[PDB]
Symmetry: C2
Subunit: 176 residues, 2 copies
């Protein structure tokens, strides 16, 4: 398996990304893939032989300092979590290379995956954020293991008690 | 002065909006004004105008980011007059009503602290993040408190968003009653 910057001129590789996004989330695909091919963004591919098994992207939202991690998609396979970890690490390195400081992301709790759903998050917001528990292997803990910290929540974002969890990580050393 | 829905077929209103976005924020919309005005008039979005004597004095917009339930408040632009905060309060209230009418549940926004406007800047926000958020103080009339007076609560911050110790403050408010 090789991790490299996504070659945006391999059309079948792009269509592989578009099938991957088609199959992981039924909620089509070519339009969003073309948004992910913006030269403004960072696009990283994880390729085994000529098969695309992983893709990760980042959007510069705050100049060059703040980047949003979107999306991360890995074919359901063996070592899925390892490919995802490697892609995250490579993306952090790319963002640092361009003068980036922090990567942040939103991961939704749509079906009671965490203890932040099914509760009124405006009451003791940060006490509930600090005491979060993973109820159904929600991906938030995946990023928590890679150094990302929950720094915010959007109450009722996707419907009542279906919030978005905001996680961030500063990927370069603090100046001293 | 009247707050009403922005007429997306008014080129005169559009050019007034592009003049306001140019003059209030020369940094952002000096070259982006026609482009971003056309981006702000997307029919999926909400566009609300504040007009006094056929002059566009205020504008507020909202983007549906989470289906139709979660909306981001962007942008809010008021001409620098003595009634700036009244116009803004007025626009926020009208926008909340608009978003609720369209099936929206929560409106959220980001307000950046670039130069020590609050106590959340000029510090490592990764050290005692939520205690520093809870003990926040407005040092130089930062807009976060303007939104706090309108019912918005700080629900998150992004440390080092705009550079080291120049964070973004995330605020949210749910605009419809809790169903029982």
């Amino acid at each position: 398996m090789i991790i490299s910057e996504f070659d945006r001129n391999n059309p079948v590789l792009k269509d592989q990304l578009s099938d991957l996004l088609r199959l992981t989330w039924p909620e089509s695909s070519a339009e969003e893939v073309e948004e992910m091919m913006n030269p403004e963004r960072i696009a990283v591919a994880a390729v085994d032989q000529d098969e695309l098994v992983g893709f990760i992207g980042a959007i510069p939202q705050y100049g060059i300092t703040g980047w949003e991690l979107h999306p991360l998609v890995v074919e359901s396979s063996r070592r899925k979590n390892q490919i995802g970890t490697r892609l995250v690490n490579y993306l952090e390195k790319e963002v640092a290379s361009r003068g980036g400081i922090t990567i942040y992301l939103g991961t939704d709790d749509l079906d009671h995956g965490t203890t932040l759903s099914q509760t009124d998050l405006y009451v003791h917001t940060f006490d509930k954020v600090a005491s979060i528990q993973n109820l159904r292997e929600h991906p938030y803990e995946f990023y928590e293991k890679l150094g990302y910290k929950i720094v915010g929540v959007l109450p009722n974002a996707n419907g009542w008690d279906k919030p978005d969890i905001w996680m961030a990580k500063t990927i370069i050393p603090r100046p001293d």
